[PDB]
Design a protein around this ligand. Structure first.
Ligand SMILES: CCn1c(-c2cc(N3CCN(C4CC4)CC3)cnc2[C@H](C)OC)c2c3cc(ccc31)-c1csc(n1)C[C@H](NC(=O)[C@H]1[C@@H]3COC[C@@H]31)C(=O)N1CCC[C@H](N1)C(=O)OCC(C)(C)C2
Ligand SMILES: CCn1c(-c2cc(N3CCN(C4CC4)CC3)cnc2[C@H](C)OC)c2c3cc(ccc31)-c1csc(n1)C[C@H](NC(=O)[C@H]1[C@@H]3COC[C@@H]31)C(=O)N1CCC[C@H](N1)C(=O)OCC(C)(C)C2
Ligand SMILES: Nc1nc2c(ncn2[C@@H]2O[C@H](COP(=O)(O)OP(=O)(O)O)[C@@H](O)[C@H]2O)c(=O)[nH]1
Ligand SMILES: Nc1nc2c(ncn2[C@@H]2O[C@H](COP(=O)(O)OP(=O)(O)O)[C@@H](O)[C@H]2O)c(=O)[nH]1
Ligand SMILES: [Mg+2]
Ligand SMILES: [Mg+2]
Lengths: 169, 163, 163, 168
């Protein structure tokens, strides 16, 4: 059988968690805003000549429900931590998410990828080196994406699978 | 000679593309003929207009229920059900066309297309063909499946026949 | 005196029953009039024929997107969206009728009906009405909901108006 | 907030687990046979005066997948073990279902309820007596149901919630 990878997409709402996920799964761009309750998706892909099964959980960032994030973080194997490059508050929210994933998993070594989305937009407020320095200090990869143009969408999900394999050995 | 049939697949009425199948009449003639005849509709009924009711990404796409259109029906050209003809052919990989069933000797019209090796089905489901052209379309159908197989858009055989 | 409106609910086209609502124009007149006018269709658009797109047993039934029918749309009689009128009234229990939104001052036409007390929504969603007759219809609608709100049947406002 | 309860229904195929679950959930009877992959349902109810949320996992009884059945067995708090009173095979399968559940949970007493279903049929091959004597050995309730006429549906699951509550 093919190995299954449980990926969880997290971040403040409005950053593009769902748009990135729907691009991966369906290869089109959701222009409308449908703030997420919880959705799960399945896709098989070839990563490094190895077919595997991606199980993707697309989550709610609603702050009212921050203390209910715990069960999905316990079950998830790796995490796409998403912010929008035109929203400094979503970048600041990243720390709170990473801290919470570590605190819930009780481990400093959790597969994660930092994703800066909306890189098609001109109104950027978070420097690339600012996000890179942050990713470096976490010890995780950083990828800029656009769910609209598809830039980096596969790279982000495939790189997280590669982080899960590394952590697994 | 192994005949070839085709499905033209639609997504919520929108043409998606064509999948063609080689039917292994030379190893399972009775099972091949059933699927051939249901793909032409030459007996007065068959696949045209039916849906793919279960799509599970990483495993398979299943359809063929043209009597109830809800996943429980279907019928063969030989009557309600017919026997497992043999298990010579195996679920070796993507593209395998095999019969759905509800236990031994319950083949009707429902079928599935593997998108992966499913060897735990070997000796239980009759393999009788394989995708010839259009595997990319079967792959695109997985865009609309889910873990338990419920589909998120209506996936239909808008046309079908014999090539 | 506070107006009263009704929905005739159908499930895959089959009548389920009538639910009616008292709209608290005495306390939220702007928000009550929006809902009233959309129920009658008098502005040339409204709830008739729209679906309950999100039903989460234990919590609420949500609908009101008559422009896109996918959960993202809807519009008010004042413009696409309008400001939060007040948060005087609370989500005290089943039958409370309250506005959906996407943050402060984004009321359109989507609304939800509580099937439980949802106190943490107080101050964030404008409560403007409550079920008068037919709460058992709303309870019966929960049978078609799920954990993430996806419905297993098409739940429609087959007809609506003012009483 | 109301308390939530995660229940899991098991049994060989054809016995009526989904028809029982769907009767509990939707009060509708499925006369057509639609074998299960995996389904989850939610229903709010009042049991002994306390409102609660039932989260019900309806499972497949295919023997090829008995390995993975372990996983939901971890998450489930109670198990409705269904056989059909015209299917002796599904009755013999019950013992196997009990053994595995007791394994995966690693206890002798898991919240659990035996259900003899289809009791509307004029045919019977499993006597009431047999299923009573089996249930009594295990120390769990026994209830005959009929999804077709809806006899005993609510009793089965509430009893199950009342077995979860009593051991919780
Ligand atoms: C345990 C969950 N689970 C899985 C499964 C299993 C695994 N593995 C097993 C193998 N391991 C290998 C050693 C390593 C790895 C882990 C992983 N994840 C899953 C899924 C995604 O978790 C939800 C399955 C599966 C299948 C059934 C029930 C549950 C299942 C099931 C129900 S009924 C049936 N099977 C036969 C059915 N009959 C009818 O539909 C009758 C209807 C009425 O009369 C005409 C008509 C039929 O003919 N087919 C045509 C053929 C494929 C088949 N359906 C089907 O859909 O298989 C689905 C699937 C995913 C291929 C298998
Ligand atoms: C964390 C899980 N989770 C829950 C929730 C929470 C809880 N705990 C239990 C414990 N309790 C404490 C003791 C008190 C707290 C709640 C349990 N289980 C759940 C669910 C079943 O776990 C999957 C929810 C919830 C809600 C959201 C996201 C995730 C959520 C969410 C996304 S968007 C929104 N919410 C507001 C939404 N906006 C739009 O639709 C915009 C669209 C675009 O612009 C027009 C239109 C809107 O206005 N409403 C109208 C109002 C009810 C509201 N939808 C909605 O559906 O709430 C669902 C639900 C279940 C009530 C809450
Ligand atoms: N220009 C642009 N817009 C985007 C991008 N990704 C998401 N959006 C828009 O941002 C809004 C929120 O997207 P969504 O996927 O719902 O965010 P989520 O709350 O994180 O799931 C929607 O309007 C999307 O169309 C992107 O990469 N570029
Ligand atoms: N006579 C009778 N038939 C039933 C009853 N419950 C289920 N059935 C039928 O038994 C068949 C199998 O039912 P189903 O719920 O799919 O069984 P499952 O595979 O165990 O989930 C279907 O045709 C049902 O309508 C019952 O109480 N009485
Ligand atoms: Mg989202
Ligand atoms: Mg079933």
């Amino acid at each position: 059988g093919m190995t299954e990878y449980k990926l969880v997409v997290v971040g403040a709402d409005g950053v593009g968690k769902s748009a990135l996920t729907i691009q991966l799964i369906q290869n089109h761009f959701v222009d409308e805003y449908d703030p997420t309750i919880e959705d799960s998706y399945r896709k098989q892909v070839v990563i490094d000549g190895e077919t595997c099964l991606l199980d993707i959980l697309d989550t709610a960032g609603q702050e009212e429900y921050s203390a209910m994030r715990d069960q999905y973080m316990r079950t998830g194997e790796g995490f796409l931590c998403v912010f929008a490059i035109n929203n400094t508050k979503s970048f600041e929210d990243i720390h709170h998410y990473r801290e919470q994933i570590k605190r819930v998993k009780d481990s400093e070594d959790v597969p994660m990828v930092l994703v800066g989305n909306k890189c098609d937009l001109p109104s950027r407020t978070v420097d690339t080196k600012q996000a890179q320095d942050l990713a470096r200090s976490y010890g995780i990869p950083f990828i800029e994406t656009s769910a609209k143009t598809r830039q980096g969408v596969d790279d982000a999900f495939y790189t997280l699978v590669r982080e899960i394999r590394k952590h697994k050995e | 000679v192994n005949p070839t049939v085709f499905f033209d697949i639609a997504v919520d009425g929108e043409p998606l593309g064509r999948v063609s199948f080689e039917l292994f009449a030379d190893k399972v003639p009775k099972t091949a003929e059933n699927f051939r005849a249901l793909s032409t509709g030459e007996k007065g009924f068959g696949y045209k207009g039916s849906c793919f009711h279960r799509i599970i990404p990483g495993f398979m796409c299943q359809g063929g229920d043209f009597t109830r259109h809800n996943g429980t029906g279907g019928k063969s050209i030989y009557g309600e059900k017919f026997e497992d003809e043999n298990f010579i052919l195996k679920h070796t990989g993507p593209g395998i066309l095999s019969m759905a069933n509800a236990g031994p000797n319950t083949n009707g019209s429902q079928f599935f297309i593997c998108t992966a090796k499913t060897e735990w089905l070997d000796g239980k489901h009759v393999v009788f063909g394989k995708v010839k052209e259009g595997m990319n379309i079967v792959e695109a159908m997985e865009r609309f499946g889910s873990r338990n197989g419920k589909t998120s858009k209506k996936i239909t055989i808008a046309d079908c026949g014999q090539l």
